[PDB]
């Protein structure tokens, strides 16, 4: 019953779901910035994949999954959610979810907007910044080669990339079947080391 009352207070007047107005109040009550890492973890746990929305089922299944029926109960889980997201297999799952989440399927697109990709990459790696992440994100904001978005395979293979190479770049082969964007980046990153 507490869960029903909790849902009802953020729920949309018309739809059977939490939309943006509720989502914002919901994060406010959690005392959490709406764009911060714990909120990504929550969306992950609730299996949302549509930004700024929790359907009735996602909210109920997600609250049940973390054993909370209250604002205070959810907050109490945060530290263990943070811990969970650090385990190797959970992280891979959170990482795959993060692409789908950032993806506007309402249109819908098949690629992430460059800037969402940049924000989500920063967010998802919160607890574990790989050596190559700072420059990779500098490279993308500059966007030397004018890409429109980030596809599912580029997102997918980026994780392995971060594990294979750097800080040295000694394990990078231009000959390897990496998405070509990775090569564009390695060049760009060689140039900036020069100009440095």
């Amino acid at each position: 019953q507490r869960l029903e009352e909790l849902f009802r207070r953020y729920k949309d007047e018309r739809e059977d779901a939490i939309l943006e107005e509720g989502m914002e109040r919901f994060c406010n009550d959690l005392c959490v910035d709406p764009t911060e890492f714990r909120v990504l973890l929550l969306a992950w746990k609730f299996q949302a994949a549509t930004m700024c929305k929790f359907t009735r089922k996602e909210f109920f299944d997600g609250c049940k999954a973390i054993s909370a029926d209250s604002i205070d109960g959810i907050c109490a889980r945060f530290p263990s959610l943070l811990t969970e997201a650090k385990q190797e297999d959970k992280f891979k799952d959170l990482y795959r979810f993060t692409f789908q989440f950032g993806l506007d399927s309402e249109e819908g697109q098949r690629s992430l907007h460059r800037e969402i990709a940049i924000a989500l990459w920063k967010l998802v790696f919160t607890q574990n910044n790989p050596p190559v992440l700072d420059q990779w994100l500098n490279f993308l904001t500059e966007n030397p080669s004018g890409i429109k978005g980030i596809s599912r395979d580029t997102w997918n293979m980026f994780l392995n990339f971060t594990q294979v190479i750097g800080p040295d770049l000694s394990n990078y082969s231009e000959d390897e079947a990496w998405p070509s964007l990775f090569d564009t980046f390695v060049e760009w990153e060689m140039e900036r080391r020069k100009r440095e």
């Binding site: 943006e20 107005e21 989502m23 914002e24 994060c27 709406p34 764009t35 909120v39 969306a43 930004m51 700024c52 950032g102 969402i116 924000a119 989500l120």
Partner: peptide
């Protein structure tokens, strides 16, 4: 919720 701010405007 990266798109929340835009969606609220």
């Amino acid at each position: 919720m990266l798109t929340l701010a835009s969606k609220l405007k």
